[PDB]
Scaffold this active site. Structure first.
Site, PDB file in Angstrom:
ATOM      1  N   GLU A   1       0.860  -1.170   0.000  1.00 42.22           N
ATOM      2  CA  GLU A   1       0.000   0.000   0.000  1.00 42.22           C
ATOM      3  C   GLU A   1       0.898   1.222   0.000  1.00 42.22           C
ATOM      4  O   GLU A   1       1.860   1.287   0.772  1.00 42.22           O
ATOM      5  CB  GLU A   1      -0.891   0.004   1.243  1.00 42.22           C
ATOM      6  CG  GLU A   1      -1.864   1.166   1.294  1.00 42.22           C
ATOM      7  CD  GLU A   1      -2.765   1.122   2.518  1.00 42.22           C
ATOM      8  OE1 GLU A   1      -2.503   0.316   3.434  1.00 42.22           O
ATOM      9  OE2 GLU A   1      -3.744   1.887   2.577  1.00 42.22           O
TER      10      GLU A   1
ATOM     11  N   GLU B   1      -9.622  10.146   5.124  1.00 41.01           N
ATOM     12  CA  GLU B   1      -9.900   9.252   6.243  1.00 41.01           C
ATOM     13  C   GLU B   1     -10.470  10.101   7.369  1.00 41.01           C
ATOM     14  O   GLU B   1      -9.800  11.021   7.852  1.00 41.01           O
ATOM     15  CB  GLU B   1      -8.634   8.532   6.714  1.00 41.01           C
ATOM     16  CG  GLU B   1      -8.047   7.525   5.721  1.00 41.01           C
ATOM     17  CD  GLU B   1      -7.012   6.626   6.369  1.00 41.01           C
ATOM     18  OE1 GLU B   1      -5.956   7.119   6.809  1.00 41.01           O
ATOM     19  OE2 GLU B   1      -7.259   5.412   6.454  1.00 41.01           O
TER      20      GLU B   1
END
Length: 223
Positions: A120, A204
């Site tokens: 990631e 987020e």
């Protein structure tokens, strides 16, 4: 707005782009809600926004709503010539605990599920409050004309590289291949055995609100 997505995983696709009201961590909250909205789209990019309030679960991400660039599976990272991207965004309040970040997965299997990868890569353009990436910081690195704090962590089998901007970058144009290239030659990242899985930009959300992130423009060109 043109389209409103308030359900968990509410989804829109068009013009080679997509939006996901990706409230994956909402069970961690004691209360809250979140919607994502399409303001417009064309082959050259998308305009969207999201509004949310979340409380409880102080250190838990409640959601990563995103706009994704769509692309065919099977593109080996070292064979990709460009992962160019441009974004302009703003939060209506900084009194939140949240970030603004690109999220990118790669995997040796080009058909890996799109919710994770072998690796990631995150690029945090802003962070509000005491929120922190996975793992630990390993120093400042110069990538693509800018400086970033590099964090390295491990989530199961997946190794996570997060590049953190030193102050909020509300408008950013970047070549994401420069980040993969840096990792290939400085962090042992096996780019020749990896394929691109997702390419997303979003926020987020941890706690706070009501708050809105508006994305005036998001585009990417992957070839």
């Amino acid at each position: 707005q043109q389209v409103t997505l308030c359900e968990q995983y509410g989804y829109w696709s068009g013009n080679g782009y997509e939006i996901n009201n990706n409230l994956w961590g909402r069970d961690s909250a004691t209360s809250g809600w979140q919607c994502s909205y399409l303001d417009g789209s064309s082959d050259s990019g998308i305009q969207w926004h999201t509004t949310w309030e979340w409380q409880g679960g102080q250190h838990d991400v409640k959601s990563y709503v995103y706009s994704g660039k769509q692309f065919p599976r099977g593109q080996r990272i070292t064979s990709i010539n460009s992962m160019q991207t441009s974004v302009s965004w703003y939060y209506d309040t900084t009194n939140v605990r949240a970030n603004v970040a690109y999220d990118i997965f790669t995997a040796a299997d080009p058909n890996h599920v799109n919710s994770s990868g072998d690796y990631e890569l995150m690029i945090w353009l802003a962070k509000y409050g005491d929120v922190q990436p996975i793992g630990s910081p390993v120093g400042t690195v110069h990538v693509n004309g800018r400086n970033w704090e590099l964090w390295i962590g491990m989530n199961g089998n997946m190794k996570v590289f997060s590049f953190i901007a030193p102050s909020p970058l509300n408008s950013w144009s970047g070549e994401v291949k420069e980040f993969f290239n840096y990792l290939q030659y400085n962090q042992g990242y096996p780019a020749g055995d990896q394929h691109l899985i997702v390419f997303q930009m979003g926020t987020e959300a941890f706690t706070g609100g009501p708050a809105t992130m508006t994305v005036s423009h998001f585009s990417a060109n992957i070839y």
